[PDB]
Design a protein around this ligand. Sequence first.
Ligand SMILES: [Cu+2]
Ligand SMILES: [Cu+2]
Ligand SMILES: [Xe]
Ligand SMILES: [Xe]
Ligand SMILES: [Xe]
Ligand SMILES: [Xe]
Ligand SMILES: [Xe]
Ligand SMILES: [Xe]
Ligand SMILES: [Xe]
Ligand SMILES: [Xe]
Lengths: 656, 657
Amino acid sequence: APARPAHPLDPLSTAEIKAATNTVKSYFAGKKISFNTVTLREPARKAYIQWKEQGGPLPPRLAYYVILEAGKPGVKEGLVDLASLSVIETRALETVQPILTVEDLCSTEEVIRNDPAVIEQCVLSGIPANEMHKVYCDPWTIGYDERWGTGKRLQQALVYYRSDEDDSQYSHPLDFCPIVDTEEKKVIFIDIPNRRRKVSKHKHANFYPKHMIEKVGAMRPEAPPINVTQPEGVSFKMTGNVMEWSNFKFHIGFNYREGIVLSDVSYNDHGNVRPIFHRISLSEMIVPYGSPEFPHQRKHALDIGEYGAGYMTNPLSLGCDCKGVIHYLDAHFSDRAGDPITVKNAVCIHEEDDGLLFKHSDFRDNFATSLVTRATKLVVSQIFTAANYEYCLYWVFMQDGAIRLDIRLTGILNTYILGDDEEAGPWGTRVYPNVNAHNHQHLFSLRIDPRIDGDGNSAAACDAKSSPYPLGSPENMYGNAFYSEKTTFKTVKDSLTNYESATGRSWDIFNPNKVNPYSGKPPSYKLVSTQCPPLLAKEGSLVAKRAPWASHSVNVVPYKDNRLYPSGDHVPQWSGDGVRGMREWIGDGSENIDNTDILFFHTFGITHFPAPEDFPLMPAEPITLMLRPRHFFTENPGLDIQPSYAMTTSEAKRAV
Amino acid sequence: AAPARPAHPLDPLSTAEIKAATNTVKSYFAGKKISFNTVTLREPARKAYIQWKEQGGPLPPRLAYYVILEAGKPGVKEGLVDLASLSVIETRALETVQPILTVEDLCSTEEVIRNDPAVIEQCVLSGIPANEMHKVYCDPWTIGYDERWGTGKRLQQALVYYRSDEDDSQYSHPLDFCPIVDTEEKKVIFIDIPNRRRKVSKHKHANFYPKHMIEKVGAMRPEAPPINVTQPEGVSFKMTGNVMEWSNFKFHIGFNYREGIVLSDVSYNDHGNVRPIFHRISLSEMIVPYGSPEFPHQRKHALDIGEYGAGYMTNPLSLGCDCKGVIHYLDAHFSDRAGDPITVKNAVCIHEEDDGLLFKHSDFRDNFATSLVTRATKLVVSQIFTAANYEYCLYWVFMQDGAIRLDIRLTGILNTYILGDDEEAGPWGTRVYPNVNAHNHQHLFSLRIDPRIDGDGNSAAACDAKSSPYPLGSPENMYGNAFYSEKTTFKTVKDSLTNYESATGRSWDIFNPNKVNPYSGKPPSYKLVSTQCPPLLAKEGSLVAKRAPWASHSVNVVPYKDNRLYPSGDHVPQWSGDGVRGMREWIGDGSENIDNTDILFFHTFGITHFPAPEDFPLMPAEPITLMLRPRHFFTENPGLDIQPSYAMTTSEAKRAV
Ligand SMILES: [Cu+2]
Ligand SMILES: [Cu+2]
Ligand SMILES: [Xe]
Ligand SMILES: [Xe]
Ligand SMILES: [Xe]
Ligand SMILES: [Xe]
Ligand SMILES: [Xe]
Ligand SMILES: [Xe]
Ligand SMILES: [Xe]
Ligand SMILES: [Xe]
């Protein structure tokens, strides 16, 4: 058997991955199979908490796998018990398609380059037959196409042209879209537009220094350096994947799909170790485009479920992506042959200055009486690339007990061709000659499994409201009275709520079994999040059906094991019809979510109307949300941090 | 004779100019007993400044604006001094207004209340012996507005607290009554006494210095290992007097008693084409309205900028502590009541900081070996001001993508009032400590933008994300996914009076309708991206809504006129909110054109604060931010000529074999 990990939540080691794939190959001996997913099946919540806190049973070390078999539709999935090297659960799912791996993305170009029908379309588009090596494609999942459903595993090849291998191809989209059978390695159809548009004759819009020297004359001189050093080391302590920093303790996990997973998060409140979250991660995304023209409706990538924030994660360059003293973690997956693959330096962990934590000075002695304390933050980060997109993901822990998720969007706009006389509006922007960058949203589903000060939690919407009593009434004489209206969610239906600017809505996750001895309110973490776009796609649309979670800013459902992925376990080519994922978890909306084990799914993100500033490479666009302790502590938890400067009134006086 | 002329017409008054101004005013009013409230630069007219800077035009006169009080006379006198001729050139008496309260004014009240027989009596009734008045403190806010006195006397309300020891933080021990003090007569004229009396708390003070924390929690945390920031080869920015040049931005850094930092004449050098962006940007007013309806708490709605001043209240920033790294500091200079210049050392800090990634892209085809990454630097111009209990840390941030951000961090101490043993603080406040009620309040700010986007003649618009009006299944929207941005250009002032809307992810554009982006066909713009836009919770016709007409909308756009700086009026304390002044005057009947002209864009933003015990006895920083981003201003990402931190092309990746 493979060696047991230091911790039940540790990801599978390369040894465990190989042990799992050998087990599966043996079980299916004599069959031609390939591996899609080999990943930790995390212990049940109850099982984990019982093990960690109650001296309970050691949970079994299990691997979940997804395989394909040549000549069979869909996938097979199951579980391997690593201790006994045995398959313990198995099922065939003939009507689903699974996540696309890096191997799957890389395979499509040589398929389309050698297909006679695609070659013909390139020639019609102005690219000679002997120049197919200049044709590239981003081979997205087809997403959903009602012509084929899930009956074949399909990609759509979004085609581009490079005049030179070092070009950025996105200035030169082609007009047609080949449909490729991933497993058969053949083009089965090409979507050809009614109005043909030949390849742009313009120079490529490039962005490397050699290109910029040509374009603008010279690079800026190297700026003088800003150096960051920690000569005495760091304040955080890692024991395997377990982090301890500024009273926080948590497990840093990682998988193919969600990327970073933070588990078993607690805060040591002066010797009282208080749980906050069992698990927090990003669980799905959708990036719906806003051009109604065919076939652009198929642009609505669910990046997490269709490609994977782990599979697509960047090896972080030392030390350019992350500045300062860094602790890195590697990621391990399976390739199609069942061999372990490694992404080196997939996660970076470091602490950074974060400005002021708090300050107060007394005007009475001209601010000579003063205390200032500087803040440090702990950052656990990754960057993943989904074809043209880069998503920089930063989980940030703060010394006031708050936890923040920061995202920076960069990379390149997805572009489609634009005729010389064609208007890009209202659905996109002409960002370069013959380049149409379509409108799109980026939406994310944050999954929180809370344990605020222990088990038995509830959630609520908090709305700022003026007093209902009118100006001039005894109750509100000067009309200034206002309060926070808390609406505790009793059943799932109550929780389906959106952000509201009219009330500056926040949401609480709280423990109704406990009371703050000062304020009389339950301990809570409050979700403060204002980048909460509505889902622009209509009710009943392909986008709304495939991403049921995205229609509301907040969805709260009962906890059950294996309620991770709110658009379903196998996302590509699902029509959005059926009771699975968030639609299944919501059910008829009647289940209790008050004082129980709950899951809080939050939809946040941005709506992107491209502009030329975004091209040929986009400056980082920020997205953030925060979870803040409110009524959790009885006072500012950071006051025992040594001030950077402190002078009392008496000290100020005796300094004469 | 005359003071030396400044390096630049927007430079604040020097100490010599302040003294020249006050000498001039003292001479003009010789034989009269006068005191100085304000002596500040009167900035050149916009037209005059731009003509001087860009058109070889006349040098604008160097002018000082003053506000004075005269003993035995109501209200104030105000006017202008021509510094070159040392003469008063404009003057008027305003008998029915009251002016901004200075640090001197805040410090004077404690001596008054400690020695007043009626106040001493109330302290004794509250459980503090008559011989312990040295332990009684107050934050002497402006009265704000009280309909019993209007502007007929200059008044403060003394919010009273008790310290058991001078080093205590007093805010755990508010008293129940509120003395009303005549600022100029130095006497208590009234005391607001509540119907139910509450004696001083017997609890220990809630303290926060290390010596206190050692007693409370046992020990301080060990000193953490240092994070050191060095720039061994110096900084990339260049200052010429108060003019900053950094990453193609150029602008003038100004400062005054009221707004604090004022950024002017902001342009961007687009490969040799120096393009104007903003003529002037600053915070122009605030209001911090409290949400308890009980008397006299309606008088808690400080307009901190207009009533105390982000300049007057600014902190001298302690070296290596408030600001980390290699810093350029500026000093602030004001007048005291005697007409003598006073200095706040290190009032503004200027520095550059790493700001993470600017952009990155890698190619999946060679496992991300083809990759470019460029790190971001930001330029930060910052101050921290203290209004009694409040600390506002203000950071003006310039970025290498051409965006400009305002970041605010709120810290300091909750304003607190007394709470009985059996008294419920809700729904209007929170019990954050025994016998301590911290009332609900909002903090609202009015950002004033005088734009010149790619030159003169600007307009403003609301931008709203909308689904296509065509239904799912229609030929126009077959799969129901279509969406667009609906731009509503403001034609008249009335059109501009708009709020943030989450339902449409509303942003606003300031743009130049006279120009066109050659790629997108859209006008060059800067877009306001701002979502911390609370509604004003106080009712229409309330004291708060009347005194802060600007706060009722997220956006107010009005025609430019000279001296349209302060949207709650020039003299804010004790104004009832009745009258056509400030933003109410500028809006008028709402009919004036604001399309393709000189406009002023006032933006209301901020937070609603429901206190919690985490905020006490000292509050962790709470962030507020907004950004102005170029959209259709450039024809491509303006930062691409910055040297990457790492770059490897596809060909280079293959050559690594
Ligand atoms: Cu985007
Ligand atoms: Cu506040
Ligand atoms: Xe892709
Ligand atoms: Xe390059
Ligand atoms: Xe994608
Ligand atoms: Xe978070
Ligand atoms: Xe004050
Ligand atoms: Xe101390
Ligand atoms: Xe104040
Ligand atoms: Xe700004």
